[PDB]
């Protein structure tokens, strides 16, 4: 119930307070999957992109409190291109049977194999896809090693 | 109860966007808005490889509010544009008209992208879009126009424009 090898220490520690995991069914898997998404965000943005996913806002929320204007919106994209374009990272079962979740938060969909959707592949450079496909290959190894295939597929659905 | 040429996602998304039961020809209007939404999607299959267009139509208001803050732009919830060019920084509304000839801005807030029932683009609209995008729209609207005649709901569509 602790962290896997392929997940960075930085990412796992960062993921703890972002969501109440024990509350959720397959809470540990759910946490690991979100850590995949966040890692892909880092890989894509390693600057063109700001990674909004799991960003510290407490200082911002604090300033809004003192001026009573408006707290920052919860519904944030995972990352934002400064083209002025927002993106959300998805993990899917079928690139084929895929439809866009938002026309504003554009989807960057991937297989568990690490295969990008057609639009997603255009955005990325080959350098970035190889890291993501390389990273998600390590992830899937851990998935089968713990026989957690069904839990992950369900969590994707 | 969806027509075939309309995608299942588009049809599911369209249900709650407007109270269709309330309207005179509510079913037709639901499908007509689905054309507009599809045309928005067809237009937004264009990349710079970043997406050229954001499609504001039938989006969660929280999402619209967020980017508009980031793009330093703003529209009334009544008249919000259907899509926004991210390169040119110009907002658009998809119109379906019978006559392209005499057309001039519907709104001073956004530029209009008008199309026929045949699938022919207006002059200003054609200047903005690429041929790639028009053939998709003209191809899709031929599928639509066939479905209209196949079910003989032709006049009902013409009036409500």
Numbering used by the authors:
A (entry chain B): 2 to 47, 55 to 90, 92 to 166
B (entry chain A): 3 to 50, 53 to 165
What does the paper say about this structure?
The three largest gene segments of the Thogotoviruses, THOV, DHOV and JOSV are homologous to those of IAV and code for the heterotrimeric polymerase. In this paper we present the atomic structures of the putative PB2 cap binding and 627 domains of THOV and the putative PA N-terminal endonuclease domains of THOV and DHOV. Despite very low sequence homologies, all domains have similar folds to those of the corresponding IAV polymerase domains. However, the critical active site residues in the putative cap binding and endonuclease domains are not conserved in THOV and DHOV and, contrary to the case of IAV polymerase, neither domain shows the expected in vitro biochemical activity.
The corresponding construct (residues 1 to 169) was cloned, expressed, purified and crystallized. The structure could not be solved by molecular replacement using that of IAV PA-Nter due to low sequence homology. THOV PA-Nter comprises four principle β-strands surrounded by six α-helices. Comparison of the two independent molecules in the asymmetric unit of crystal form 1 shows that the region 72–89, including helix α3 and the following loop, is in two very distinct orientations. In chain A, this element is positioned as in DHOV and IAV (see below) whereas in chain B it is dissociated from the body of the protein, rotated by 90° and inserted between two neighbouring molecules in the crystal. For THOV and DHOV PA-Nter the putative active site is more like an extended groove and furthermore, is positively charged. The extra positive charge in the putative active sites of THOV and DHOV PA-Nter arises from the replacement of acidic residues and the introduction of extra lysines (Lys38, Lys61 and Lys97 for THOV and Lys39 and Lys100 for DHOV PA-Nter). Surprisingly, for the THOV domain, addition of Mn2+ or Mg2+ ions destabilises the protein by 3–6°C. Interestingly, the significant difference in thermal stability behaviour of the THOV and DHOV domains correlates with the enhanced plasticity and much poorer diffracting crystals of THOV PA-Nter.
